[PDB]
């Protein structure tokens, strides 16, 4: 059994105009998380993690994320394949992920050197999940940008308790 807030139609998710793939490369800190599977948790609050975007020769991204868990750095890797338009992607080697039938990424907005908002949508075990990530080039962002991310998340149907701002750490993510 599972009850999820429905995924928004793609019409409600903007696309970053004139997307420059080479400028989006590098490390981003996850300063905000929102989604239908994301829950606020004051007992064990979400720790900040990082995601590195590297363009390959064929213009796909090698996306490597690192998080601090159980006193160790856990790495996980995926391939974002360019989609129907620039700033859009699908997942490479989807068959290597048990239960996964669909995976979409859309870059909503970015200035490339400070911040970015990225929309994800996937179907896993026939359940449709979506999330929005607030990327920061630094671990801290302005209140204006964080409130913008909150209202965009709310526009896609998510309540406050489905929006989290991970706490900055130094382990694993400063590399
Ligand atoms: C929780 C969640 C929602 C959507 C995604 O695309 C994903 O990777 C994770
Ligand atoms: Cl993964
Ligand atoms: Fe994922
Ligand atoms: Na832990
Ligand atoms: Na401020
Ligand atoms: Na750093």
Swiss-Prot record:
Keywords: Apoptosis, Cytoplasmic vesicle, Disulfide bond, Glycoprotein, Immunity, Innate immunity, Ion transport, Iron, Iron transport, Pyrrolidone carboxylic acid, Secreted, Signal, Transport
Keyword Nucleotide-binding: no
Listed Gene3D superfamilies: 2.40.128.20
Residues reported to bind a carboxymycobactin: 49-51, 122, 131, 135
Glycosylation sites: 62
Binding site for enterobactin: 103, 131
Tissue: Detected in neutrophils (at protein level). Expressed in bone marrow and in tissues that are prone to exposure to microorganism. High expression is found in bone marrow as well as in uterus, prostate, salivary gland, stomach, appendix, colon, trachea and lung. Expressed in the medullary tubules of the kidney. Not found in the small intestine or peripheral blood leukocytes.
Cellular component aspect of the GO annotation: extracellular exosome; extracellular region; extracellular space; specific granule lumen
Example of a GO biological process term: positive regulation of reactive oxygen species biosynthetic process
InterPro entries: Calycin, LCN2/LCN12, Lipocalin, Lipocalin_CS, Lipocln_cytosolic_FA-bd_dom
Cystine crosslinks: 73-172
Family: Belongs to the calycin superfamily. Lipocalin family.
Functional description taken from the UniProt entry: Iron-trafficking protein involved in multiple processes such as apoptosis, innate immunity and renal development. Binds iron through association with 2,3-dihydroxybenzoic acid (2,3-DHBA), a siderophore that shares structural similarities with bacterial enterobactin, and delivers or removes iron from the cell, depending on the context. Iron-bound form (holo-24p3) is internalized following binding to the SLC22A17 (24p3R) receptor, leading to release of iron and subsequent increase of intracellular iron concentration.
Subunit structure: Monomer. Homodimer; disulfide-linked. Heterodimer; disulfide-linked with MMP9.
Name of the featured protein: Neutrophil gelatinase-associated lipocalin
């Amino acid at each position: 059994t599972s009850d999820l807030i429905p995924a928004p139609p793609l019409s409600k998710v903007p696309l970053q105009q004139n997307f420059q793939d080479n400028q989006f490369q590098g490390k981003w800190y996850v300063v905000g998380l929102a989604g239908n599977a994301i829950l606020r948790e004051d007992k064990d609050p979400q720790k900040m993690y990082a995601t590195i975007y590297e363009l390959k020769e064929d213009k796909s991204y090698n996306v490597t994320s690192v998080l601090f868990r159980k006193k160790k750095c856990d790495y996980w890797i995926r391939t974002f394949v360019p989609g129907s338009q620039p700033g859009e992607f699908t997942l490479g080697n989807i068959k290597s992920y048990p239960g996964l039938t669909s995976y979409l990424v859309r870059v909503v907005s970015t200035n490339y050197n400070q911040h970015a908002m990225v929309f994800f949508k996937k179907v896993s075990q026939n359940r449709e999940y979506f999330k929005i990530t607030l990327y920061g080039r630094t671990k801290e962002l302005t209140s204006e940008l964080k409130e913008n991310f909150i209202r965009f998340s709310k526009s896609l149907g998510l309540p406050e308790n489905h929006i989290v701002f991970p706490v900055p750490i130094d382990q694993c993510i400063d590399g």
